């Protein structure tokens, strides 16, 4: 049950993971999660604000 995944690039390929333990808590770090939605903090407004339009009309 080997997972083959992309490595993080260095100066100049893939790596293999096998989980040895029956508990997911034993696993190495979660894979890179690039998810983001800054707008829930930077723009949590009820009515859409178009950048090119006046903020207050």
């Amino acid at each position: 049950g080997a997972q083959v995944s992309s490595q993080k690039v260095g100066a100049h390929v893939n790596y293999t993971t096998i989980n040895y333990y029956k508990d997911s808590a034993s696993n190495a770090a979660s894979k890179l999660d690039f998810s983001q939605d800054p707008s829930k903090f930077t723009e949590p407004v009820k009515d859409i604000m178009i950048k090119t339009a006046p903020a207050l009309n």
Binding site: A25, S26, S30, L32, Q36, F41, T42, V45, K51, T52
Partner: protein
């Protein structure tokens, strides 16, 4: 997935005014350079890999230093040096605590690692055979040791690790063990409602997470009986949050901590150094 590339843009002369906004709305400024200057095309190959929560928290941090000793104890005080108990917390140190407290709530598994060191208390009391340590996790309710060699150390159900001095730092994983759906880093409340005309003391009660938090106890002993040479030991406890989720960001701690709460110290509430002038580069 990469950070934003810059598009090729020239000038404008337009009723479109992306440079103006109204932050009264609760929206941050949104304008980017292409809105207010002429820009070249720049392909951005750079990523935010190292600022993901897993990357930010992906370090074993020291959270406490425990002490235990092994010698022929003839007093109550010296008997209590043969083992130690520690209420598990991240508030004995400041560095991991401050990083966690960017968030109100979290959910993670824990990697715990230990670094165990010894020194001789004295010379001319001979030597000491290599020591084995027991680190016993005592969940809330399980009996706590009152002596280094009492019945509790048989540890039939509590997890224990037996560590041999000089071996690789011992390590184990702990699941997300919270009784809520996440850990609370902050709790604006009390453990019970004090009621009208009750006789229960209201003068010496506490507030916040300290009234409700209990992650149990780490108990440590040297398993060996005493040598003629007294050995003193330090156990450094390391925590790494892994498989991390966090919610509800907070301003970070700006002034020294003075305990387990958010309290501040009167002589340490001036973090800024005054500038000579508002016009100082």
């Amino acid at each position: 997935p990469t950070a934003q590339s810059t598009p090729l843009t020239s000038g404008v002369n337009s009723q479109e005014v992306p440079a103006l906004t109204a932050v009264e709305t609760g929206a941050s400024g949104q304008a980017v350079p292409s809105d207010v200057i002429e820009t070249r095309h720049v392909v951005n190959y750079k990523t935010r890999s190292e600022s993901t929560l897993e990357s930010f928290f992906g370090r074993s941090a020291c959270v406490t230093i425990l002490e235990v000793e092994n010698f022929n104890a003839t007093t109550d005080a010296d008997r209590k040096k043969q083992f130690t108990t520690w209420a598990i917390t991240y508030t004995d140190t400041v560095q991991l605590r401050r990083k966690l407290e960017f968030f109100t709530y979290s959910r993670f598994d824990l990697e715990m690692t230990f670094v165990i060191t010894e020194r001789y208390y004295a010379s001319n009391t001979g030597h000491a055979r290599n020591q084995v340590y027991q680190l016993m996790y005592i969940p809330p309710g399980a009996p706590r040791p009152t002596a280094w060699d009492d019945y509790t150390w048989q540890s039939s159900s509590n997890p224990s690790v037996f560590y041999t001095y000089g071996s690789a730092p011992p390590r184990m994983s702990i699941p997300y063990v919270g009784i809520a759906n996440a850990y609370s880093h902050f709790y604006d409340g009390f453990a019970r409602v004090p009621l009208k005309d009750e006789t229960v003391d209201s003068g010496d009660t506490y507030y916040g997470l300290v009234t409700i938090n209990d992650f149990g106890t780490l108990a440590v002993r040297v398993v060996n009986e005493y040598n003629p040479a007294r050995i003193t030991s330090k156990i450094r406890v390391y925590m790494k949050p892994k498989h991390v989720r966090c919610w509800c960001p907070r301003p970070p701690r700006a002034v020294p901590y003075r305990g387990e709460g958010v309290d501040f110290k009167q002589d340490s509430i001036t973090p800024l150094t005054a500038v000579e002038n508002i016009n100082t580069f």
